[PDB]
From Swiss-Prot:
Free-text function comment from the UniProt entry: Cytosolic calcium-activated calcium channel that mediates the release of Ca(2+) from the sarcoplasmic reticulum into the cytosol and thereby plays a key role in triggering cardiac muscle contraction. Aberrant channel activation can lead to cardiac arrhythmia. In cardiac myocytes, calcium release is triggered by increased Ca(2+) cytosolic levels due to activation of the L-type calcium channel CACNA1C. The calcium channel activity is modulated by formation of heterotetramers with RYR3. Required for cellular calcium ion homeostasis. Required for embryonic heart development.
Protein name: Ryanodine receptor 2
Residues shown, of full length: 1062 to 1206 of 4966
Tissue-level expression: Highly expressed in heart, lung, cerebellum and brain. Detected at lower levels in adrenal gland, stomach, thymus, esophagus and ovary.
Species this chain originates from: Mus musculus
Gene disruption phenotype: Embryonically lethal. Embryos die at about 10 dpc, due to defects in heart tube development. Cardiac myotubes display enlarged rough endoplasmic reticulum and cytoplasmic vesicles that contain high levels of Ca(2+).
Length: 124
């Protein structure tokens, strides 16, 4: 028979040189990391405006006004290095020492952005 945003002090903004910092994540959930301007919203999407340039590995996408598939995803217990060069306006991301690649075969993530008043590290 409801994401949380974290950043540094606005006075620590940079306008020249090469600046690099690390972001470790023991998990692989919703996490974005990048560089914002000292006017970015603490409640808006990290990067969805002209005030931040980020990267989200949960979908392997660089984050700007829109999303573009960039790099690869991470896993539990990984690190990512952010580098920003202001003399040439270039941002780069390295997942565990491996430089991320875009679809056009270029290691560069963002290019040709105005310095404005500075770039501060930011995570979400």
């Amino acid at each position: 028979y409801r994401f949380r945003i974290f950043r540094a002090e606005k006075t620590y903004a940079v306008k020249a040189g090469r600046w690099y910092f690390e972001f470790e994540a023991v998990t692989a959930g919703d996490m974005r990391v990048g560089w914002s301007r000292p006017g970015c919203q603490p409640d808006l999407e990290l990067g969805s405006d002209d005030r931040a340039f980020a990267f989200d590995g949960f979908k392997a996408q660089r984050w700007h006004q829109g999303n573009e598939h960039y790099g690869r995803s991470w896993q539990a217990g990984d690190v990512v290095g952010c580098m920003v060069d202001m003399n040439e306006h270039t941002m780069m991301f390295t997942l565990n020492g491996e430089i991320l690649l875009d679809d056009s075969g270029s290691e560069l993530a963002f290019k040709d952005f105005d310095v404005g008043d500075g770039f501060i590290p930011v995570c979400s």
